[PDB]
Every structure is written in C-alpha cells, then in structure tokens.
Design a protein around this ligand. Structure first.
Ligand SMILES: CC[C@]1(O)C[C@@H]2CN(CCc3c([nH]c4cc(Br)ccc34)[C@@](C(=O)OC)(c3cc4c(cc3OC)N(C)[C@H]3[C@@](O)(C(=O)OC)[C@H](OC(C)=O)[C@]5(CC)C=CCN6CC[C@]43[C@@H]65)C2)C1
Ligand SMILES: Nc1nc2c(ncn2[C@@H]2O[C@H](COP(=O)(O)OP(=O)(O)OP(=O)(O)O)[C@@H](O)[C@H]2O)c(=O)[nH]1
Ligand SMILES: Nc1nc2c(ncn2[C@@H]2O[C@H](COP(=O)(O)OP(=O)(O)O)[C@@H](O)[C@H]2O)c(=O)[nH]1
Ligand SMILES: [Ca+2]
Ligand SMILES: [Mg+2]
Lengths: 439, 54, 428, 331
C-alpha cells in the first residue's frame, strides 16, 4: 500500500477539496469525527482506503490532505465548518491577503512568503508515509493563488520529490462564474510553468459543469455548491481505483501509463453519466448501453469539444454499480459501429475497463439522484485542444494591447514571460494537431 | 473484440478489450527566479518614492 | 480584516462624506451613538471594513475629517450621525483656502497636513490588513482639491503599496459661478492621474441635469445632488461591505476595472433615480434595472456612453431578485449593444448581486463603467481652462501663492494626454 | 434583431446572403472579430470551429460542416467511397479512382486494374498511356487522383459536345438534405473529340477554361427547362426520370454516409452548408459523380433565388424574423 497526498490550493481547490472529502467520507463510512466502525484495524492498517486516510491511536481517520489559500476567509470555513474534527490544524494553511486575481502576485510576490512553510507542512505528511507515490493537486486556473502559487508549489515538489507523481484537477475559467477579466492571462501563465511538472491533468471547464447543472439537474442558476458536488462525483470516479480493491489504475503511475503516452499531451477528457435530478418524479433507469453511449456525447464531457474531429490515444471506462463485462463489451460493440472513434496509428483501438460494484454514493440532500450504475470515461483525445485554442485566442486579444499587463510587471514579472508562456501554448496546440492530422 | 487480463474482486472486475491492434529546474535557479523578480518590484518602488520625494 | 481608511476634506468632501456614513451606517444597523441594532448577521459580517471595534459593542467610522476652516466640521459634528466620529479625527485649520488650489496644496494646506497625516497613521497603525484609502472631495475648490491631492501624495509616499481611491466631485458652471474652478480641477486631475488607483468621477454637471431635467427639481440644492451621490457611493461599495465573490476589496476591483494605469476614471450610474422624499410605490423589474443603469440619463458623469466604448464594467444589483433573470438581462445588454464593448477585452462586464437592498428601495442597480467616453468630461474642463489660461487670466491668485506658469502648462498637458489616451483606445 | 460576422470576403453566394440579411432591418453586421454573433459566414480554411457555441446568451450558427472536407477533397472523396461500407462497392455511380502520390496509396493497386481500353485523367492532365500520367503527378508536389475518363459521354445536339451538371444542395442544421430545383449544365462550345483526347476545352467542360475558346448557350449555360425539353424531343424521356432520379439518390447516399461524423444535432453550435455536386451523364443515360465542392459559386441567373432560399431554409429556420425552391431528399 502506498499513500497519496492531496493539496488543495485557492478558493476553488479548497471548496472542491471539501466536497471531495465530504463524499470520500460517505463512501468509506467515516463519520464527521474521523471514526469508522468499518475499520477493525483500530490505530492503523494497510487497507486500500488508507492511501487517503492515516489512522490515529484514538481511532480517528484523518485525510492526508493539505489545504492552502493566500487568505483566510474560505479555509476558515473548513476550520469552523462541519468537518472540523477531521483535519489537524497544521494542514489548513492560510495567509493574510490574497493574490488579487493576479498570477504574478501569487507566484512571485506572495509565493516566496509562504512557499517554505507549505513545503514544510507537506513534508510533515510525507514523513508519515511508508511508500508515498505522489500528489493530487486541486486548483483553479483563473485566480491568483490557484494559478500562481500552484505553479510555484509544483516546481518545489519536483525538486523535493523527483521520484513521485503529480496529478492535477484543474478548473478552467468560464464567464458564467468567473470573477476576473484576466483569467486567460493567469491560465496560460500557470499552464506554461506547471506543464513539465505535471504528469496527468484533469481539466474541468466550469462552463461544461454549469450547463450539466442547468440542463440535467434543472438548477436554474448553479452556484459553486451545485458545481462542486458534481465535480466531486467525477473526481471520486477517477480516484475510486486508489481507495478500493481493484486491479485497474491502482497507483498514480498507472494513470500516466494508461492515459498519457506523450508527456505534454497529458490532459485527458472526462465524461460522466448519468446526471439525473434527485427531484425528478421517477426516472426510468439507464442501462449499461445507455450510460456508455452517453460517454460519447459532448454534453456530458467536462469540457465541451468534439472528439469526432480528433484522434484518440487512450480510453478508460470506470463503472460504478450494477455492471458486468458481457454488457460492457456488448455496449462497445454497438456504439463502435455508430460513433466516430478513430485512434492514432501508434495506439490500438481499445478500452481499459474498471467496475466497482458499489453504486455512486449520493450526498443526502444534494441535487443528484441515486442510480443503479454510473460511468466515468477518461479518454485522451486531441479534441480537448479546442479548449486551449479558445483560451489562447482570449489571451491574444488582450495581450496585443498589453491590457492589464502593468499589473503583472508591477509585481516583478517581466513582460517577456507572457510571450514565453503563450509560445509554449502555441507549440502545445501544434503537438495536438500533429497527432490528430489524419482525417 | 478480444477481452484481455480479466481480474475479479469482491468489489468489481477489471479487463482490457481491444477491437483492433495498432500499426527540471533546481532549487537554485528557482530562487534566482523569485529573488530577481522581487528586486525588480523593489526597484520600481524606490523609483516611485524617489519621484515623490522630488 | 481588509480595512479602509476614509478621508473627507473640504466643504463638498465633508458634506458628501457625512452622508455616505449616514447611509451605510443605517445599512449596517449602526445608530448615531454607534451601537449595532440590526436584524441580520450579514450587516455585521464585514463591518470591519469601515468601522473600528470599540468597547461596549460600539463601532466608530474609520474616518478622518479635514478642512482648513472650522465650519462644515461644526455642522457635521451637529449632524444626525455627527457623534459617531472619533473626536480626535477632526483635523481643521482657520484661514480657509478661498477656493484656491495653491492655498490648499502649497501654503495654508502645508501648515495643517502633518497633523492630518498623524491621525491617518494612528488609524492605519491599528489595521490588521490595510486595503488602502478612500477620499471624498471636490475638485473645484481649494481644500478638497489642493490639500486633498496634497494629502494623497503624502499618503502614497508612506503607503506606496496600498490602494488609493477617490470620489472626486467635478465642477460645473450650471451649479457654481467661481471663475477659477477650471484651474483647480485641471490641477487636481493632474495629480489624480498620477497618484490614485481608482477615481469615481462624480460630475456636478450630471447631478444637475438629473435633478433638474429628470427629477423635475426646479430649484436644486446640494442636498438633492448629494442624495444621488450617497446612493451611488453606497452602490459602488456594496461589494466591499458585504459577503461576496466579485470586486470584494479595492485591489481586486482595480485589477478588473483598470486595463492601463492612467485610465482609472470611472462613470458611476444608478437606478432608479429618486428625489429625496420620493416614497417609491413599486419596485423596478430586473429588466428595468438593466435598461436604466446603462442609460445615459442615469450616469453621474455628463458623458454620452454611445460616443465611446466600455473598457470594463462592474454591475451591482441589490434586493431580492432572480439571478437567472439578472444574468439573462446582463447578457442581453451586451449582445444587443456589442459594438460598444471593446472586443479586445473578452467578457469585460462582471455582475454581482446583494440580497440586502438600500434604504427606501426594494430593487436597485449600480453601474461602474470605464468608458473612453469619459474624455468628454476632461475635454469640457480643458476647454474652460484653455480659454482663460491662454491669456494667463486669474493666474496672479496662484503665482502669488508661489506657483509658476509651468505647473499649469504641465497639468494642461497631462490632461490633454489623458484624453488622447482615451481616444487611442476607443479607436482600437 | 440578430447579428452576424463575415469572414470569407470573397464568397459570391454569401455576399448576396449578407446583403439580403441587412436589407431585412432585423440583422446587424458586426466587426468580424466581434464574438457576439449568431451567424458566422465563415472563412474558407481553418475556420475556428472550436470557438463556436461558447458565448452564453447566443445561439450560434455557421455555414460550414466541420469534417465535410472528407466529401469535398478529391483525395478524401475517393477514400471516402472505397472505405465506407454504405458506398464502398455498393457503388455503381463513381468512376474508378485511386489516390496517387508524387514520390498508404494505390499506385501499385492501380496498375493492376489498368491493363485491359484504358483512358484516365489527373493544371489537369488526361491521357491513355499510364507512363505519362503517373509521371505527371510525380511532376508537381500535390496529392493527386487518377480516375477513369468517361470515354463515352452523352453529347448534346446541335453540336456533338460534352457537358457536366452542377447541382446545388443545402444541408441545414437538422440535417435536412435540400436540392435546389434549378440546376445547370456547363456545356462545351466545340464538339467532343472521339479518337485522341488532350486538346482540352472540348474535354474539360469546367467553366472558366471554356470562357476562353468558344455559340449555343449564353455563357455555355443550359438550364433545366431547356435540357428537359431537349431530352424529351431528342431522347423521348425527361430530366426527372433519366438524370435527376439518380442525382437525388447520389446526393442522399453521399451525405447520409458522413452524417454521423459531421451532424450537429447535439452539439453546442449548429452548422449548415451549401454544396456543389458535379455529375457526368453518359451515353446510356447513366449518371456519374465527379467532384463535390464545399464552397460552390452560383450561376448569375440563379443567385437571387438560391441565396434567398439559403436565408429562408437555413438561417430563418434558426433565427425567425418578426412554394419551396428546394426538393427535400427524404431519408
Ligand atoms: C445644487 C445647489 C445649487 O448648487 C445649484 C444652483 C446654484 N446654487 C445656489 C442656488 C441658486 C440658484 N439660483 C440662484 C440665484 C441667487 Br441670486 C442665489 C442662489 C441661487 C439655483 C436655483 O435656481 O435653485 C436653488 C440655480 C443657479 C444657476 C442655474 C440653475 C439653478 O437652478 C435651476 N444655471 C444652470 C446657471 C446659469 O448660469 C445658467 O442657466 O447657465 C449655465 C444661471 O443663469 C441663468 C440665465 O439662469 C445662473 C442663475 C443665477 C446665472 C449666474 C451664475 N450661474 C451659476 C448657477 C446658475 C447661475 C441652483 C447651488
Ligand atoms: N467550480 C468551482 N470553481 C471555482 C470555485 N471557486 C473558485 N472557482 C474558480 O476560481 C476562479 C477564481 O479564482 P479562485 O480559484 O477562487 O482563487 P482563490 O481560491 O479565490 O484565491 P485567489 O487567487 O486569491 O482569488 C473563478 O473564475 C472560478 O471559476 C468553486 O467553488 N467551484
Ligand atoms: N455635488 C456636490 N458638490 C459640491 C457640494 N459642495 C460643494 N460642491 C462643489 O465643490 C466646489 C467648491 O469646492 P470647495 O468646497 O470650496 O473646495 P475647498 O475650499 O478646498 O474645500 C463647487 O464648485 C461645488 O460645485 C455638495 O454638497 N455636493
Ligand atoms: Ca485500516
Ligand atoms: Mg481567494
């Protein structure tokens, strides 16, 4: 057994992280106070779920989590909130004033000021691990902390743990909920600087989640709580394989091996189904065929984009609930003839499949209805580059006039770092194209 | 078409299915990075105070 | 606790300052004696941004009151909320400034400035996490204008890395008849361009137009004008005083509003417009809010927004209403008038909503635009300036205080540049 | 009101489409890089499809189907039919063809079917001896295709001259396949040349190269009421029974084949597109497909009507304002 440490950075990482541990706790049967009747290894154990929870002499199961926001307001809610007993104070790290939606201010100005302390509190968790494998890093692209500090933390982590793996859950900026016109700046900045230091990044476009909440949950104007419960669902699916018995995606290296043949093209598309409103007067349940097909519908992707126009390099099917392989393979047979699923030549057309019999856990009171089976697909398609083309266009429109740039320079960053980041993204867009040129 | 490496638990199963076969910066440079940036913002300010003292 | 130090200087600055306090003091449930008597923890949640915590559960405005003559401060001290202020925070001279910027900036004002500054320190000193400063003042007189911008220059020397914010009342010949006001305003704008982070251009020309044409007030008073100025000031600070996601401190507002350091002059706008005593009979619908707060009749700066382009825009809704509907209307606005929003700043309209409405109203909206159309204001003042300055008229009132023509030539130059900078970007 | 941007400043067809829209008083035209449009009349190449359908508040529609280049490139069209079971060797209406590369191609597989009377075709080159064809592609550096030249093509009279048939098809956002009732024959001005074929002009009906060597039709343009009348009096039949039936079938099969790759039924933006289908009619009144052009231009006589039909079928269907010219091909 090997542990994973989760690092939640910024408002979005912290609030998302909170929904994940809320969910995590339900699934493993841990109560708001760390106690877990299921565990008869009182004081410890090398069980699958211990990769995410260490165990306290008194019986407390404690997330291997570390939160960090360059200001106290949001994490203060975790200290005071409903799961206050779950975390030890040393892993809820707050500064005083925040990055002001300014990448430069979060990387350079206030980075330095808090980096060492974060690396310290982090090394405090590695020391408590028999066989640490790496980190799950949650953050927004668009805030100053989520973009700027995260790219700083990522570089210190590679220097201080070259052996270990680093996975990102990144939140991609959407006007419907963004709080800053400069998000495309911070997004390109942090992608360029984190790129070589991340092994697998799961990009969640707030826009995609927003419309799933309106269209399928009937939420008229989704808040961050709606948004975050769904993301915690999807995040749970991608991690289920590290907290439960299984033979698929059992440690972080496998995510890269199964999902990422090319290091830079390490951004796999996630697609989840079914999203059903719990307030919906009886729903006719969906089959393994129906949920699996729904996996190739753009309206269920965590990023709107058209995988028909692009190739595939890898595909993972992650089932939760009442599924057996005869139905999975039978479903793939059917859809395989209907949909446009071209892989790249240097890769075989195929699907790795994982089934957990326990159906998705619902957060009592949330918007999601319980369903007898569910599926998250993790496919690596060049079509996700679409997201980089939109974000790169917004950047080009602003930067060509140096709009707002003085805010970055004013913090010690040189204008040219802007151009070096955008050129990195230019090259990344070329990579995706090269691999996807076929049709 | 071909179902490979089936693996069964009491929690689920795992397997591959193929339909068709194929065909680091150091702590040093980082400190240079931050320190140099801080000295540019330290200078910019000093210029500001100098202009105000004028 | 992201504190803000408030400074009001001069007649205008002190009269709209006391009104701002009066209004947000009610909004937050603080009575004249300074004690909380409200029915919502929301009212107290961020009370630290404008009030200091005192013993007895008492809240004192973190406010400094400044003037070179003793009236005003007198009437302020005997105003409804007069007694809430810390009494050491009244700093005042005797001579006055005689509507002369040079007297405010250079002579009479230099005598009293240090003692103002000490109080600023004492307040700053106390601060957990200082956002910066907000200054109320007029640009047409001597004290607010000349000593107000002196004060700003000093404060920036001590707190070079805090935010400097001003509500600056612009002079208009429809409301006043002192011939040297264009001098005082041009000298002030020069300073404001250099040393503030955000300036709300509160234009007496627009306040007059609204009150006289729109509200059918045939004998407008400064009380009328200040009624519109205190609703605006409440509006544009909702996001700093209540819990919220958008523009919730001064730096974050500055990063969303200011794409180029010198173009930091905002046009506020408010709807519905009301006369003091208008006893409102129905609330506006969300679509009336939106049409109206972008209407030129609702701007507090006498500029035609259709004559320029919006660089950035914040929109603040107050009252109980539908987020879906607010969102639909804000999208409608931009998509039906999309040539008016520069395309090289994608998504430059940001929208916030506050459940708690202002006093009197069920529904309100507050508009903050960074339009290149603000160049109409500076052009108006520049043309008055030039008409006098090209014959060096009335200059002896300044050269006699020590100033040199050169200083005027430069102010004139910096403002004519400001206008050209606004025109360059409206042609992009 | 609705808005639209114009990003292919050369389209004849969409010139008349924006003029039509403006002149309705209900459609404003924006700065081409203003993203707050409903309609993008889009550029011809590297149209930025991934930017569409991410503007909340806006339904967005564009006048190309991403991926419809499969059908409209001479190299891809061939490979589309060969490798697509719906067409494949269900195919009786597309001449023999192979993709060829000036040195995954079929220059080897080609020689095989070659040796039989073989006349093939390729700035275009047709011959009858392989060497000079396979050597012509090896000339320039663009991917080329060699298809059987129709040695025995229906000739019009009075003139003994060849012709091709242009059909305009508009596919809207629901994937309705519409066929404009007015087609055109681009005739030849001089009589077809039996033995020997390299003169061109009389072998290439392609319009422009005919505006340069011509007598019988205004600009070598015969429309369908005349060509039907000739077919009656000359061949004792009709356009409908003899040509159009096969044409209608050929369009439906081609587009239905690629519908799963290009449909936008459940997509965050919607597409429509106007296609230009080019047919050969041969001695036996058998119809053959030649090229399909994704950016067709119209005939002068017909612009008014077609471009108004584009506006009414494919733009006002999605953006409703305040006896059809088209035949819907029913699948
Ligand atoms: C917000 C509060 C007040 O700020 C706003 C003002 C001025 N003030 C004092 C109040 C006052 C007024 N009038 C007075 C006459 C005298 Br003896 C003493 C006091 C006043 C005003 C009034 O009437 O209501 C109270 C009042 C005053 C003026 C006005 C409208 C108006 O009110 C509808 N014009 C727009 C101005 C005027 O120049 C013009 O048309 O061209 C621009 C006027 O010339 C003509 C031909 O009208 C006039 C009138 C004497 C001529 C001399 C100097 N000009 C300066 C103001 C202006 C005035 C209210 C501050
Ligand atoms: N889905 C989702 N996105 C969020 C949430 N919170 C913040 N975001 C995203 O983050 C962006 C704003 O920056 P944040 O991630 O909040 O940064 P922060 O944690 O507030 O720290 P700062 O950089 O100092 O602002 C917004 O545009 C959102 O898209 C959340 O709770 N859920
Ligand atoms: N809107 C508004 N403007 C005012 C008010 N009082 C004064 N002014 C403006 O301020 C200018 C005079 O400035 P003044 O107070 O003499 O400056 P000071 O002498 O330095 O304090 C005039 O042109 C008025 O237009 C007020 O209560 N409301
Ligand atoms: Ca255990
Ligand atoms: Mg934050």
């Amino acid at each position: 057994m090997r542990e994973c440490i989760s690092i939640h950075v910024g408002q979005a990482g912290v609030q998302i992280g909170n929904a994940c541990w809320e969910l995590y706790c339900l699934e493993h049967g841990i109560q708001p106070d760390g106690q877990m009747p299921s565990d008869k290894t009182i004081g410890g154990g090398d069980d699958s779920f211990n990769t995410f929870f260490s165990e306290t002499g008194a019986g407390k199961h404690v997330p291997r989590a570390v939160f960090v926001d360059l200001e106290p307001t949001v994490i203060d809610e975790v200290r005071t909130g409903t799961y206050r007993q779950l975390f030890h104070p040393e892993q809820l790290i707050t500064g005083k004033e925040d990055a002001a939606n300014n990448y430069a201010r979060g990387h350079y100005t206030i980075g330095k000021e808090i980096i060492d302390l974060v690396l310290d509190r982090i090394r405090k968790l590695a020391d408590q691990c028999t066989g640490l494998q790496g980190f799950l890093v949650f953050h927004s692209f668009g805030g100053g902390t989520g973009s700027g500090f995260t790219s700083l933390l990522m570089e210190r982590l590679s220097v201080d743990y070259g052996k270990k793996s680093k996975l990102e859950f990144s939140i991609y900026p959407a006007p419907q909920v963004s709080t800053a016109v400069v998000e495309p700046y911070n997004s390109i900045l942090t992608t360029h600087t984190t790129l070589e230091h991340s092994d697998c990044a799961f990009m969640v476009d707030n826009e995609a989640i927003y419309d799933i909440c309106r269209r399928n949950l009937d939420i008229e104007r989704p808040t961050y709580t709606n948004l975050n419960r769904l993301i915690s669902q999807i995040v749970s699916s991608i991690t289920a394989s590290l907290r439960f018995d299984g033979a698929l995606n059992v440690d972080l290296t496998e995510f890269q091996t199964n999902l990422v043949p090319y290091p830079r093209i390490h951004f796999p598309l996630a697609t989840y189904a079914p999203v059903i409103s719990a307030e919906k007067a009886y729903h006719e349940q969906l089959s393994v065929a129906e949920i699996t097909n729904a996996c190739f519908e753009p309206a269920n992707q965590m990023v709107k984009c058209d995988p028909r126009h692009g190739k595939y390099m890898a595909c993972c099917l992650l089932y939760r609930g009442d599924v057996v392989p005869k139905d999975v393979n039978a479903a793939i047979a059917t859809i395989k003839t209907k949909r446009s699923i071209q892989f790249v030549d240097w890769c075989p057309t195929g699907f790795k499949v994982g089934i957990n019999y326990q159906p998705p856990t619902v957060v009592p009171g949330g918007d999601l209805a319980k369903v007898q089976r569910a599926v998250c697909m993790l496919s690596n398609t060049t079509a996700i580059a679409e997201a980089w083309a939109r974000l790169d266009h917004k950047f080009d429109l602003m930067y060509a006039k140096r709009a707002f740039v003085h805010w970055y320079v004013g913090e010690g960053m040189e204008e040219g770092e802007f151009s070096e980041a955008r050129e990195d993204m230019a090259a990344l867009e070329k990579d995706y194209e090269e691999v996807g040129v076929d049709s | 078409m071909e179902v490979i490496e089936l693996n069964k638990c009491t929690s689920g199963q795992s397997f591959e299915v193929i339909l068709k076969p194929p065909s680091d910066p150091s702590l040093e440079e980082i400190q240079k990075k931050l320190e140099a940036a801080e000295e540019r913002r330290k200078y910019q300010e000093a210029e500001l105070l100098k202009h105000l003292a004028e | 606790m992201r504190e803000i130090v408030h400074i009001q200087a001069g007649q205008c600055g002190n009269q709209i300052g006391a009104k701002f306090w009066e209004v947000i003091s009610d909004e937050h449930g603080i009575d004249p004696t300074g004690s909380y008597h409200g029915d919502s923890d929301l009212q107290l949640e961020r009370i630290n941004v404008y009030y200091n915590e005192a013993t007895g559960n008492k809240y004192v405005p973190r406010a400094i009151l400044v003037d070179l003559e003793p009236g005003t401060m007198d009437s302020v001290r005997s105003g409804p909320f007069g007694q809430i202020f810390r009494p050491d925070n009244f700093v005042f001279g005797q001579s006055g400034a005689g509507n002369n910027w040079a007297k405010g900036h250079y002579t009479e004002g230099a005598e009293l400035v240090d003692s103002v500054l000490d109080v600023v320190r004492k307040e700053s000193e106390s601060c957990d996490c200082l956002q910066g400063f907000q200054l109320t003042h007029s640009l047409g007189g001597g004290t607010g204008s000349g000593m107000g911008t002196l004060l700003i220059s000093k404060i920036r020397e001590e707190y070079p890395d805090r935010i400097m914010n001003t509500f600056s009342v612009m002079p208009s010949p429809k409301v006043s008849d002192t011939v040297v006001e264009p001098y005082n305003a041009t000298l002030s704008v020069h300073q404001l361009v250099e040393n503030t982070d955000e300036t709300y251009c509160i234009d007496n020309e627009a306040l007059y137009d609204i009150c006289f044409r729109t509200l059918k007030l045939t004998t407008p008073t400064y009380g009328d004008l200040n009624h519109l100025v205190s609703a605006t000031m409440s509006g544009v600070t909702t996001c700093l005083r209540f819990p919220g996601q958008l523009n919730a401190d001064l730096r974050k507002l500055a990063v969303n509003m200011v794409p180029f350091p010198r173009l930091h002059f905002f046009m506020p706008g408010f709807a519905p417009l009301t006369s003091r005593g208008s006893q409102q009979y129905r609330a506006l619908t969300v679509p009336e809010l939106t049409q109206q707060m972008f209407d030129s009749k609702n701007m507090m700066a006498a500029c035609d927004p259709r004559h320029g382009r919006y660089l950035t825009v914040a929109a603040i809704f107050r009252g109980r209403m539908s987020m879906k509907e607010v969102d639909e209307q804000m999208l409608n606005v931009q998509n039906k008038n999309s040539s008016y929003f520069v395309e090289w700043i994608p998504n430059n309209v940001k929208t916030a909503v506050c459940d708690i409405p202002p006093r009197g109203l069920k529904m309100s909206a507050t508009f903050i635009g960074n339009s290149t159309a603000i160049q109409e204001l500076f052009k108006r003042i520049s043309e008055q300036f030039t008409a006098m300055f090209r014959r060096k008229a009335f200059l002896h009132w300044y050269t006699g205080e020590g100033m040199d023509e050169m200083e005027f030539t430069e102010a004139e130059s910096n403002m004519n540049d400001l206008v050209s900078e606004y025109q360059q970007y409206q042609d992009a | 009101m609705y808005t639209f941007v114009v990003r292919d400043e050369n389209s004849s067809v969409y010139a008349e489409v924006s003029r039509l829209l403006l002149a309705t008083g209900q459609w404003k035209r924006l700065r081409k890089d203003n993203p707050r449009f409903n309609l993008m009349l889009g550029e011809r190449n590297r149209l930025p499809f991934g930017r569409l359908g991410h503007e909340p508040g806006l339904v967005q529609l564009v006048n190309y189907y991403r991926g419809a280049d499969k059908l409209c490139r001479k190299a891809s069209l061939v490979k589309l039919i060969k490798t697509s079971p719906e067409l494949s060797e269900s195919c009786t209406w597309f001449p023999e063809s192979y993709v060829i590369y000036p040195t995954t191609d079929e220059r080897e597989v080609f020689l095989a079917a070659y040796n039989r009377g073989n006349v093939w075709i390729a700035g275009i080159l047709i011959s009858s001896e392989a060497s000079e064809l396979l050597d012509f592609i090896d000339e320039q550096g663009q991917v080329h295709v060699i298809q059987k030249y129709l040695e025995k093509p229906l000739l019009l009279e009075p003139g003994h001259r060849k012709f091709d048939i242009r059909s305009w098809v508009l596919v809207d956002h629901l994937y309705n396949i519409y066929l404009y009732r007015e087609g055109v024959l681009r005739t030849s001005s001089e009589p077809y040349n039996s033995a020997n074929f390299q003169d061109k002009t009389c072998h290439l009906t392609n319009h422009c190269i005919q505006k340069e060597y011509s007598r019988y039709e205004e600009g070598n343009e015969m429309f369908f009421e005349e060509f039907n009348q000739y077919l009656m009096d000359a061949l004792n039949t009709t356009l409908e029974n003899s040509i159009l039936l096969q044409i209608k079938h050929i369009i439906r099969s081609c587009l239905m084949c690629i519908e799963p790759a290009i449909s936008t039924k459940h997509l965050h933006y919607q597409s429509f597109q106007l296609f230009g289908f080019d047919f050969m009619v041969d001695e036996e009144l058998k119809v053959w497909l030649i090229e399909v052009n994704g950016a067709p231009a119209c005939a002068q006589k017909l612009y008014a009507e077609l471009c108004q039909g584009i506006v009414d079928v494919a733009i006002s269907s999605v953006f409703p304002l305040a006896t059809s010219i088209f035949i819907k091909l029913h699948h």
